[PDB]
């Protein structure tokens, strides 16, 4: 047993991606409308697949939980859906919002506010989520409750009203109005589920959202990202008022590199822009300011301390899939096709590495490098909350799982405080704009019958969890991908 005893093995799940399929259809999300959009389908922006024809976890969760146990899983991260719990607006519940100029420095939810929020919530969704969380506790599951996962209620963001003349963007980013209602949602979820969860995550991969729709404007990027910082910190405070349990965030960690390691300073710049600028703000309170940016300037006013953002991060959820190689541009930087996530039309990467069915280069070395950078900068408890591959025939996933687990074992031995591993997709599910054709699951799903089928990777997973690490007789599987 290489990994420490108690190391968590499990799976991550997004509500929107896995819930619908049989009962409990939710048409009240902006992502649901994004997938049913006429322009988006005709112009190839989305696949035309529909989320309501999905894995039906809303009804089959007991079956999936037992299967998770049977393959050696003892933990999970489940994402609840804001659009399910509050189908209608919560703006009518007036709470206290403190502001220092444009800084949202505080939101306070009282017990009577929680009762008023319960009156307008969807009690059917709360009860079902409690049923899901109670079944997980019945099977001794360490439970990570993730509040937000990209999709928003239509009364928060409605893409149907948008006009394509001003850019075809989903628009699921935070404003001051959104932050206030998000704090009420965070408080209510802790008020509703705290006795059934272990830790909290305020949001999943917020950088995927605030990195888009900026028209290459760095000012719009840092300005939009500030609201996500405040969405996280205010969610943290409102949960902490109710719960004594730990609250963190789940981040998307593309491993930023330069070509043949020839530009260490550029990597430091982009790694700060894409990652540390956000985590620094909610961990130590050292954020930035957009007040003095001209529209064409690249960098923010740094060292802007905020006492209301300080110490609002208890743990870091590390999502990793591939790397991200960049070069210098007069504007700043650009990514290089043929490496990392930009391998769609590629057979092998420009480095000669295997490319997934999403067009993603397999690069387990980035996971170790991402974990070490997080450890060196923050020394916070960490959890690999997502890691997987689109692999219908399970050709690479066995070796993909082994090589990335070896990188976690090395990171731990090198000082990284990694407490568990959550593989992405226990079952195949709805992969956003790509639809159902991208199979990330350890279990394959027949979307007509909803039956789940074992891929051999699920059995390799059970062996890794049984042995508390990669046994020597399974190490050969990862050698192709180093």
Residue numbers in the entry: 0 to 481
Excerpt from the paper describing this PDB structure:
The genome of C. divulgatum encodes three GH1 enzyme candidates, from which CIB12 and CIB13 were heterologously expressed and characterized. Purified CIB12 and CIB13 were crystallized using the sitting-drop vapor diffusion method, and their crystal structures were determined to 2.55 Å and 2.22 Å resolution, respectively, by molecular replacement (see the section “Materials and methods” for details). Both structures revealed a classical (β/α)8 TIM-barrel fold with a spherical shape, which is typical for GH1 enzymes and is one of the most common protein folds. Both CIB12 and CIB13 were active against cellobiose and lactose but showed substrate preference to cellobiose, and therefore were identified as cellobiohydrolases, EC 3.2.1.21.
In addition, the CIB12 structure contains two small antiparallel and one parallel β-sheets and six short α-helices, whereas CIB13 has four antiparallel β-sheets with two β-strands each and four α-helices outside the barrel structure. Similarly, the Tris molecule in CIB13 was located near His148 (3.2 Å), Trp149 (3.7 Å), Tyr320 (2.6 Å), Trp423 (3.2 Å), Glu430 (3.4 Å), and Trp431 (3.2 Å).
